[PDB]
């Protein structure tokens, strides 16, 4: 797909095949301008344009690889915030996404193992670039990137209330407490540790958790 030119014509194909929407064409030119010439001046912009080719082609592992090809090779661009935008968003869709969500089929009970990354890479956005043009989009994702990480811990907190592992309830809930300070499922985790304690004959500790619910009613 790449004509062997100087990389600028290969960039001239690349930026036009970006505007084509043919990322399949655009990735090949965005790479092979830099493959035979690893001295492209827009290579940091290529590493922006590659994710812009990758994410709009849904190439989230390659978009994460272009982040590494941005960060290791040329992070001189202060679009690291864009890269921290294009990392916390890239690990977001790569964690748990399907076409089943037209009427509400579950995807938060699943493993948020890459939504764990999508929180932190957006957390690197809102910390390493707190005033940046992308912190606001991160903040909207980051709340689901805590709460789906909360509701999965709630999904572990719920079964030990069912199984009878009441120690493991308290280990699940107070971890969900100390991690997630505002998620409602943490208030839903809250009476389980109490009802764990009543099964574990710590009803004094449970009534303290019932006092927590009394002030986490607010």
């Amino acid at each position: 797909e790449v004509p062997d030119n100087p990389p600028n014509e290969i960039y001239a194909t690349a930026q036009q095949k970006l505007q084509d929407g043919n990322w399949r064409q655009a990735i090949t030119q965005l790479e092979a301008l830099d493959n035979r010439y690893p001295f492209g001046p827009y290579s940091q912009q290529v590493q922006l344009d590659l994710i812009y080719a990758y994410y709009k082609n849904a190439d989230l592992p390659l978009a994460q690889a272009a982040i590494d090809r941005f960060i290791r090779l040329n992070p001189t661009h202060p679009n690291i915030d864009y890269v921290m935008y294009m990392r916390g968003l890239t690990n977001m869709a790569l964690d748990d996404s399907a076409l089943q969500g037209f009427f509400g089929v579950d995807r938060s009970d699943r493993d948020p193992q890459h939504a764990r990354a999508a929180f932190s890479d957006f957390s690197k956005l809102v910390r390493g670039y707190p005033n940046s043009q992308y912190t606001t989009d991160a903040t909207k994702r980051l709340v689901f990137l805590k709460d789906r990480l909360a509701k999965y811990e709630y999904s572990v907190a719920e079964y030990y209330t069912e199984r009878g592992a009441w120690v493991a309830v308290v280990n699940r809930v107070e971890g969900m407490l100390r991690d997630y300070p505002d998620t409602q499922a943490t208030r839903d985790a809250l009476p389980l540790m109490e009802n764990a304690y009543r099964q574990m004959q710590m009803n004094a500790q449970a009534e303290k958790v019932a006092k927590i619910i009394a002030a986490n009613s607010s």
């Binding site: 903040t139 300070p181 505002d182």
Partner: protein, 59 residues
């Protein structure tokens, strides 16, 4: 390829992370307190700008 009936938009897909706003904060009463902000999931929500989710610009 495309549908021979030339019809799209029959599904909306998953976009739920795009809109999540911080829920009702937990207020631990004194003597019953637990430090709820130990992990990074007490989000460093900061002053930055732009639209929400993925609809914001991608260079």
């Amino acid at each position: 390829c495309s549908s021979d009936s030339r019809y799209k938009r029959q599904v909306s897909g998953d976009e739920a992370y795009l809109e999540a706003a911080p829920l009702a904060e937990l207020h631990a009463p004194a003597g019953m307190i637990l430090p709820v902000t130990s992990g990074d999931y007490a989000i460093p929500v900061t002053n930055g700008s732009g639209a929400v989710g993925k609809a914001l610009d991608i260079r």
